[model samples]
Target: HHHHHHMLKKKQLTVLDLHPGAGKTRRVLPEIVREAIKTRLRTVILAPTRVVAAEMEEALRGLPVRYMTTTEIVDLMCHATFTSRLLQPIRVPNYNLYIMDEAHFTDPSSIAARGYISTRVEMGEAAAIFMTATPPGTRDAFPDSNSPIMDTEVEVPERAWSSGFDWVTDYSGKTVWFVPSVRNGNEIAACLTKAGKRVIQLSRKTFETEFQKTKHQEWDFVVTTDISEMGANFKADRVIDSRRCLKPVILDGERVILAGPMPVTHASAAQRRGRIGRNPNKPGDEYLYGGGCAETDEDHAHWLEARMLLDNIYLQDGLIASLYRPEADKVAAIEGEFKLRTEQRKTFVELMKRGDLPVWLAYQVASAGITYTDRRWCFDGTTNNTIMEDSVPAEVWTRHGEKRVLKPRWMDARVCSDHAALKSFKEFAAGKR
Candidate 1:
């Protein structure tokens, strides 16, 4: 007989954790840089938006490490380089680590989506730590889709139940999931508004109010679209998602409601479930209604524009595929490398030479699959700073700098591939240098 002496350590690593509003903690740019610098190792930071990257660069300026960006190559500037996008595969340094801030940018179907995970697999020696409110290829399954979230080296990830639902349900006191529109809750919303409770209506139409109201202390209920559902600052005693309660019922508080179908995204639905039991003082019951009368098939329909989006991502990938192939290999290149059947790359090159798309517009198209030509720069000084610096007047460096902070949309796919290589390069460099 052998005596079992298995001891549990106080803490174990997590892939990622999402934190809503807690002031500085939500934006952990500084913390990440500090952690990297503390280790005195090569580091890379990946941000979703150019503005975010610029903001991060500014925030971490004081740290003692190389700071690089995709837009600019400021080698030895601060132990890092800022570049717009990596159009080709390059060498990496040694003992280096990469921090992918908003790691969801790697959607395979997006013209700008980079194959970061596959790259990580190729560069086995380096560390790729990704953090995002949303993960890539979430709605659809793809190669290496689940790998990042479940990786053994994952250091951060979106939030989840601590006690694995067992502790959550056992300790769960009161939670109310709001399901709007499905169960005549439109009236409830109107009633809540009439009662002067600061109800946050989340949707394309009511986003402005929710955005403005979030800063205030006293609001009846903060509402907004499911996009805002994952992370925000709220100490509400309850959470409401109007789209839920349509089909399956998952209740943990005092009671649960079963609302039925909307064919909406899972993230939006999850937001509703997360709202329950958040605040202790404002405890309330969740109301879910069932059954619906369909007036017509047109009344309820669902479809997504994946084909067009995926094609766009592929075309973009093709443009940079050649340059990104590893130097050691020639035949096993990216899919888009070398126009095998058509003159797509030639046409693309011509458009680039002719400047068919504005630099920033090109970037936007490359990144999020869409570009807003009419948008204006909203910040001054830093790329994201919107508040006025009263003592100083608006100058070239302040305004244009902010406007140019984000990466050019065209560089999206290439940037992802580049970072993958960057991760590898850092490790190789670290070992040699």
Candidate 2:
């Protein structure tokens, strides 16, 4: 018990807090790297996006450094070097400082990043510093309401833009123009072309090329979708918020489409604003455009209500619980038997709830000590609303004066069986005493 306690203590490593535009990369990171270099200590920095990686490389100009994506690092780990007959070494030397930029993704979302951090710390070598605009530890209190950043207003044309070229005639210097859809971006690009204005549309495919072009050439407008929400370091004097896009839903080409629009979140908006005026000393300007209101006042009110609901869904835990079916009833027996920690139980329950048969099956079959002759269900990869083999029997039901059916026979049986097995396992395990 004492040894196990000590092991848990080791996992609680260092977590450094730094805000966005805090000059950590330019000043703090370099200072640390230079000191490490003086002591002949190697350093490796990891960033989510190539754009951010390039910025880090540029910031530490005179250092012996190598930049790699997370994917490349995984590849390196897979192809291990053979030092001896069976001994293998870490692909990248145990560097002095391991800086992870945009490190918020180091949360549960990216299990791989968390694993890497754990492995680094377990080896008892290298310091892991996670840098981000919003720290993961304070995810609940995000969009830091007390930011030093300021917004500036820019005048948008009152009527529909005749040509994309006239879109940014007034706003001077580098301006990031955000649009609602790909069609909107293309329309703006066309307008710029007609009005003989220099503009470049940025997307995932054109990210590398457009990023390079922006650096090398001069442009009046840098138009993009929400792809530039994070990890983009494009310097601009001011940001033109021509974004008419609102929460969960948007009107697209006379069709109320439920796709492709970015999630309306406070963090996303702040990140977009953070792109410009990155220099802490000189505050940047933001132009929040109007004239994109709904046709009816009632419709505008509905939009506001929707935005409020979306905000609650993201920020409030209680609201999320209300929105989704709770999994407490599903895992109560297993949770009680194992005495699993709240977080562990929550994650396990989530995995089981998501129809990951591999995980769920392992728990039921292995934990219950059940012997199975046919393991065909283990090989099942296809899924409908739930995971099951295609040949499962269908149950017929009637709904709204129409015949409805629930296919996947074994899926239904297994769900009930799993529930009963959990109860039996609890009874069996408890009675063994």
Candidate 3:
């Protein structure tokens, strides 16, 4: 009866809209990789980001699959397809199956393998599987415009959304209170920490290590932003979901709101909810009680510019279209940013060639989509310390020879400010909000 996933025809262009806990990483993915290996064909598993890839890194162990972020794979192609040191050369630009995990993250501006896999599949050289809990509309689909089979790998209960939720209220364990922005996380964590609760915070800066504490029950409460959304290793006693995100907005010619308060898309909510309920023996409590709308049409309206911009970068090349020819569209937006990134891309190549940027640094920056120009480095008695431009310091204490104990002068004010020690849970969930 569970042979539902066993049937796989060659060139099967499919979409799997399975919700969380449908065994995507633990069971479904391992099976697919084994099937491809048994059939003497290779596969690519495209997690949306490096963090997501690392979350499921162990999920595909004892198997052969090129697991990478969608961004890194494209970066690999943009360069001469260089691999890391001392590994078997996987010298192929294309493979049999392209498994796009969390494919709903794609719209148009999404550097999420923008048009690569979609273009390839349209060209008929590859079969693709797009797995997402929240599916996008046909009009905004970036990768492939062709109608897909849209199959469900597993069916969820048709439960009424307006129903009683959860078991006992347990703040004795960790409460992963998902906030909208890192600033909010900071303010909220400050409030929670001072109230006699063991508290911590998470952002890109400390999300990786700090997350382990949440799963291992180290904190009474954890304040985090959307960065906590994807990892399957995430399991907590309860979650307080605030349905918002920090999104980029353009204004004042160059830019204004690089990160603004925006309501999260349905896809994001699903991924957020997935962070809890992972352990069957543990309590799974979730409250989607934040006041906000879901992903809106206005969000879709802005897609026209991004859609035009992304396809513009690809269609001009004709690399994918020669394989699959389709007409394109309009808009006067983000062209400058595209050209800027193009210039930045060249800047990285130049820095790497000049040996100012090492090969390992090149791999890290490009894969992470960091511009080489935005970074600076210095030395303390031959020990090099690289600093990010956004985080440049006016004054720094350098401990040479690794034996000097010094007082810390610089720390994120957001994390350590006395202002953070002022807000309470009531204020965090009430007045400030």
Candidate 4:
């Protein structure tokens, strides 16, 4: 309720302090979309991964909410208005209300994170909410923080890290083990199958069908990777952290993947915990897992005590680094280039209005890269047949001493020839008309 209120009323980019127990899709997002529709501020939801986006799409179906790529979001943020209809999915044409789930995934250390944070144009027009249990608020430290973080009595119960027990064989209830890689998932799945437990290793290939199949009474162990970490809908009896590779604030190809009792960082600990108690009606219990950061030669990372201390380091460090992020050069080349392109498109539009530039020539100047039947065709009608007919250069010849394909959308041979505007065709071809 606080999130819904802070989102609608405040309008500043604020970090929402919510535990994994909170219902983001079922509770928060649907209401946000409903409010946006009422307020005339169109809403767009951003997720760290497409798996999470797909899950959000399924959960928030029939709402006017859209899941856009980071590239599209950055592009939209850079321009006052979108050039491509593809990026203009917002129905109302009002300010964009962006709600990014799992804000920690877009850490300042990541290259893409810098892109998401770099808003070159019209920041005041749009409202944003970066929601996560852990908040790395940002370099500017501008977004107001929402206080008294929301959570429930439901949490991971304390378990003694005593020796002499198998995590897999000992558990009777449905368990979901979070592994780091493909190899780990297969190894665990193999071990569980031998122990007479029904198990399946979830992956990108089978995410859709496997998620659906798990809805019914199916397997005992549902082993997984980070794909299911964020907004996955399914609930399990318990979550086991076997993270060999710790996902860094930055996306690094050469990041060292290591394993220990401390399976996940504070950023992902909450996410992994909620995989068990998705439906708070039936709460989840904790097991023998620990989480935190390693400051020094942290040996014997035993007990949940070590975990609490670890979260402290991860949390404080993330927030501190976010504040002191490498300073950007005034008007970075990318930002300057965007402004130049904006003016270029503006000139193109004005030229179109004055009839000084032919539509055929204008398209060439704008779209420098294209093959035959260049413009993408929408088969909503007969654009496909027309492209084929227009694919032939017809009587029009090119400056290359070759005939160019793709007739401009405005051109009509029957009407133009009937109107005796045929001589203009050669002029159009010669880049003069």
Candidate 5:
């Protein structure tokens, strides 16, 4: 009797949709680690922040493992943060499996060439997991248009002090309050303490110590800075966001001007929501507290203006398509804002041009469906502007005449029809027109 079996190849990258509060550390991570241990594959888990790393370490207490930062890993291997600094290459450790926690933190630009997965693949590793609530090159899809909590107020510091305590008591379980600044965090902590809620204040300096002491401890509430914006996990049942940080405040001589609340950028809002609703069984509640002003009418007016501005900005940035308000005045306001901004001719162009022109120009070109190749830029080709290097095909470079040439050999009419080639040529030559 003859028997034959085919060995299955391991997956290069696995994107698991383990949402926040899904117990990724307790449930998912442990299982993956167990498999690695059984297979005798050396495992290294890369976390985006120290807090997360510590949390991961704590979760994997019984498992044999090592924790290292991106900095340490780069040092061991021949790597640099910026690709240009790779003057010399060095050998990197080979691990059977690699796990990147909060993998979305990896910049979209370097995901292919130097990202954790990319580097591991280069080292001849096949198995890896990229875990994150939010991933790059993808937008966050919020739960609902109808917000969870009712009577969401946009109040200033004074009103927030008076009203915040009430909100905290109304909700059950540990309430995680997100404040804008250190002063605000301390202030809120003080207010909550006076009201007799056990509150923990966490900032940049206090985070490491305070988090260690309080992560597992039972408390009424925890007040934190924007630093807790990403990786800090507090299995809270309720989250009250003081959307004050995103507001742009300026002083015209002595008078203070508050520019109302910014539209919680898609990414910001998603991460904030993740802080709550961590329990997969039942998602928690999230409330948006807009910063209030002295005059109610003025506050409303400023709020409207800010929302309009944010909608216009979001639309221009391709963050969103339709405005929340579809009414006549609201539509007119967006159109008016777009027109005014267009007339002023002030946008991201100036800021974009100030940085690396090649990348910026490449991005601009790519937006118009034009991409670059070895010999020439092609309209039909696709390119990721975030990636700096050319996407030269291996076959194209093998030809004797194509050696060292910036342009691809296949740029002739045979490759790209005359129509496409002419159109591409026109675009390339039409610059500054």
Candidate 6:
């Protein structure tokens, strides 16, 4: 009974916390272990690689217990090595606890990541505690049951944007918004300048030492081509992210006003919102302004990865399947669009393993494929309602404008039949024909 209780205590090694820019998450590991050592729990921190393991070793160096890692390092210390092979030597005598940093990466999709993870897990060196920013999910990375799942964040909506000067209207003496993007860099800069808005066009090629120095100067807005969710510190009033691109470090009360693209109602779109509301700027909003970036479209390309990770691919695949069915129940299941979303990644993994199954195969078994690059469904919602309509500029009422009857354009049926993605069937077919 005592041993069983001890095992239970040891098994408590896994602590999964899903923090979606929430302020409550805690940073554990050597810090926690450091305290536990007082209770006489000998520890063996085994991270995925030597680098992290070494870092763990350094954190606990001055403590009473010695630090030992992989077989190579362990051998040097005259301690037993940890080999995954059951018949090999054990290191438990030397250390009592194990730490797996980024342990959720245990079963990664990339061949390289998988190879390293399998070996690390196989080591079975000590009582393992897995830690990672990404918790278990539908993908192979997360286990099916008892693997922690975080609830969707309830973002408090600040409807300040619903009216008045919440938006940048000062295109006069001061800066209103920054322009970012290499391709259209000059265009945006010119527009803001013409409108009397201050502008700064930053480049990725520049060094931080110089960039930071130059950026310190006063300006209303700074522009860049790449997608960066990070906001400058107490520098500007607001940021205009012409690109929906994002990075992880930007999650700290930085308001990102996203523009240019179609699919705004995607998982990645939700993550973009994570950049704001993390600090004293409690009422910050992630304003999504949809508009095409590429010659014809924008949005989805950048958002697909983020959306796929958040909304399991399996649920989406089932929705794709629901599209082809005639029964109202099945169609309803798919049409209600997103039910049982947590399994999205699992379903995605399964569908992908079927080896190039058409998205429509969830609907019908066909070979014609949609150009995925331009045909991602993630951007569908925002593009349909926001970008498309927003693109058309209103003409003056008294202007001599020629009125013409609208053409009978339809979606491309063939592309829909072939690819299985929801798209303009007529337009797709027209392109092929």
Candidate 1 lDDT over residue span 1-433, tens digit each: 1222222111211134352222122346456555555555455655544334544666667566444443211122211121212222234443345555544431212112223322432345345444543343243211111011111111111122233323212323222324333223344445445544445544423433444454564555544434344333344444434442232221321111223444334334333334333333433433221222221111110101111121223223433222112211212223432222223323322222232322222333334322222122212124222221233322222222332222221221111122232232222212221
lDDT winner between candidates 3 and 5? 3
Q: Locate the minimum summed-lDDT window of 10 residues in model 4.
A: 300-309
Q: How many backbone clashes does candidate 6 have?
A: 33
Give the higher-lDDT candidate: 5 or 6: 5
Give the C-alpha miss distance for residue 17 in model 3, angstroms: 1.1
> lDDT (0-100) at residue 59 of candidate 1?
60
lDDT of 1 at 303: 7
Off by over 4 Å in 2: 1-17, 35-43, 69-97, 105-111, 118-126, 137-169, 242-262, 279-284, 287-433
Ranking by TM-score: 3, 4, 2, 5, 1, 6
Give the per-residue lDDT of model 3 (tens digit) for 1-433: 1323445554566777665656665567667666666666556666654555665566666555454333122211111111110011234455667676666653332322434556667666778776765555422211221122121112111111222332212246656666776666666666555556787777644665776666565667677766666544444655666666655443332221324456676556656666666655554354433544454534322333233233323322433221111212222333323322454444445434433233223333444465544332222212122212234322332323232221111111122222331122112112121
On a 0 to 1 TM-score scale, where does candidate 5 land against the true structure? 0.48
Pick the winner on lDDT between candidates 2 and 3: 3
Candidate 5 deviant stretches above 4 angstroms = 1-11, 67-96, 106-116, 119-127, 141-173, 215-218, 229-235, 243-264, 280-433
Tens digit of per-residue lDDT, candidate 2, span 1-433: 1111111122234444455565655566666555555555454555555666667677777666544332112111110011010111224354445556565431111223433443455556555655566543232212332234455445543233765434366556777777764456777678666766688888644575677788888888788766675667676766655535432222321112223233233434555666765665555355454323221222212222222122211112322211111111211121123322334433333323233222323233333333322232322323442322244432222222332233221232223222232233222222221
Steric clash pairs (candidate 5): 21-278, 155-291, 155-292, 156-292, 277-284, 374-406, 374-407, 374-408, 375-407, 375-408
Give the local distance difference test score of model 1.
0.32
Clashing pairs in 3: 118-143
How many collisions per candidate? Answer: 62, 4, 1, 2, 10, 33
For residues 1-433, write the lDDT of model 6, one tens digit per residue: 1111223244334533333233111234435454546556655444443433444555445545444443112211211122121112222343445444443331112112222223233444334454443433311211121112222322211111233432344433222232232435555566556656566665433323323543467665555423222212223223343323322111121211233322222322322233333344434332333322221212222122222222222222333211101111211122333222323323443333332222222111111222222222212222222211124511111112333111111111112221122123323212321
Better of 1 and 6 by lDDT: 1
lDDT of predicted model 2: 0.43
Off by over 4 Å in 3: 1-6, 9-12, 66-92, 106-111, 137-170, 215-217, 258-260, 279-284, 297-344, 348-433
Residue 352 C-alpha lDDT in model 6: 33
Q: What is the C-alpha local distance difference test score of each model?
A: 0.32, 0.43, 0.45, 0.43, 0.44, 0.30
| Deviation in Å, model 6, residue 75 alpha carbon | 20
Residues 57-151, model 4: lDDT tens digits: 66566665533432122211111112122112234243466666666552211222222332311234556666666554222211111112122
